[PDB]
């Protein structure tokens, strides 16, 4: 097992695509 | 820019819901003027910068997060930006004094290794503590359905804190188990 970082994009509700 | 408060995640058997406060745009101005007029309320945030989302919880009437997350930057707040009290890169670690409103969460005590964590989506999730610093999730989740949590609380069965999510130990997608600050670095970064 590895350490995986859990920042998402900005915002609220990130928007992804 | 600042760290911008943009929703938060309130908690009652431990139950957590979400609400939204703050939309993209005045975030981004947000972080820009480091001003945040908007009422604050609940146990953990949702905070974002320009490029980045996570979490912040309060305990003590401080308002913890990740280095990784914050960096230096200062939190958007009802008088301005609010600079950091404590930064502790080594235990990727960092303060503000917790706006008010924010509801502490009082250290835990008792020791427990029955813990709870409480997910960006306000999930709450059965951890086993494994030591010092890391739990196994009883039940493996991808990776994906904890983006976004870094920041967050652990919690033992009373809702006291035990701990801040920092990082996903995982295999082929899959989270195992959680590293986490504990709340004995959050006193020795304190005193
Ligand atoms: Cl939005
Ligand atoms: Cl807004
Ligand atoms: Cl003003
Ligand atoms: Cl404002
Ligand atoms: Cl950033
Ligand atoms: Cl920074
Ligand atoms: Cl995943
Ligand atoms: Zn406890």
Redesign the pocket.
């Known amino acids: 097992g590895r350490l995986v970082y859990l920042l998402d994009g900005p915002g609220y509700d990130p928007i992804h695509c | 820019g600042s760290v911008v408060i943009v929703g938060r995640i309130i908690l009652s058997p431990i139950t957590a819901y979400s609400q939204q406060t703050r939309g993209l745009l005045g975030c981004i101005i ?1 972080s820009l003027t480091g ?4 009422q604050v309320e609940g146990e953990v945030q949702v905070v974002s910068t320009a490029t980045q989302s996570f979490l912040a919880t309060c305990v003590n009437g401080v308002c913890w997060t990740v280095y990784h997350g914050a960096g230096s930057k200062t939190l958007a707040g009802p008088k301005g930006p609010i600079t950091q009290m404590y930064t502790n890169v080594d235990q990727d670690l960092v303060g503000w004094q917790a706006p008010p409103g924010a509801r502490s969460l009082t250290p835990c005590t008792c020791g427990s290794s029955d813990l709870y964590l409480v997910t960006r989506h306000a999930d709450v999730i059965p951890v086993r503590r494994r030591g010092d610093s890391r739990g196994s999730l009883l039940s493996p989740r991808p990776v994906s359905y904890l983006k976004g949590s870094s920041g967050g609380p652990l919690l033992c069965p009373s809702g006291h804190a035990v701990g801040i999510f920092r990082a996903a130990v995982c295999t082929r997608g899959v989270a195992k188990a959680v590293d986490f600050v504990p709340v004995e670095s959050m006193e020795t970064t304190m005193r």
């Open positions: 947000t001003r945040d007029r908007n």
